[PDB]
Amino acid sequence: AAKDLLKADDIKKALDAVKAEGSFNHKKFFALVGLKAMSANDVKKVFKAIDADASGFIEEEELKFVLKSFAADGRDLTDAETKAFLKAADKDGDGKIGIDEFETLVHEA
């Protein structure tokens, strides 16, 4: 979904910016990849891409592999990057990310 939804050149730019281990910031990533200005309806389509097992939530293991939803060659996130992303996104503290939490995170910038 993500690569159909989003500009190829945006994706390359976003992935380039977070190449170095430790450099992933969700706010910067969302802005560069082009998710920031997208409608809730369209952000939902990206969410479903990241929700690999179709559970309805992005749980921690899926967050670690978030970059592979944008490029198959996307690196894993580090433990710290994963924890930082999870803490920012998981608004209710239940350990995983629901759609409405994801929507809010994308648009809170």
- Please enumerate, by residue number, every residue annotated as part of a binding site for Ca(2+): 51, 53, 55, 57, 59, 62, 90, 92, 94, 96, 101
Q: Which stretch binds Ca ion (CB under 5 A): 13-21, 22-30, 36-44, 50-58?
A: 50-58
Pairing type for strands 96-97 and 58-59 reads antiparallel
**Using CB under 5 A, which of 21, 94, 100, 108 touches Ca ion?**
94
CB atoms within 10 A of CB 95: 10
On the CB side of 94, how many CA atoms lie within 13 Å of its CA? 7
Nearest distance, CB of residue 60 and Ca ion, angstroms: 10
Give residue 33's identity as a one-letter amino acid code.
V
Structure tokens at 50: 């990241």
Host H or E run for residue 90:
none
Q: Would you count residue 53 as binding Ca ion (CB under 5 A)?
A: yes
Q: Which is nearer to Ca ion, 17 or 99 (CB)?
A: 99
The binding site for Ca ion (CB under 5 A) comprises: 51, 53, 55, 90, 92, 94
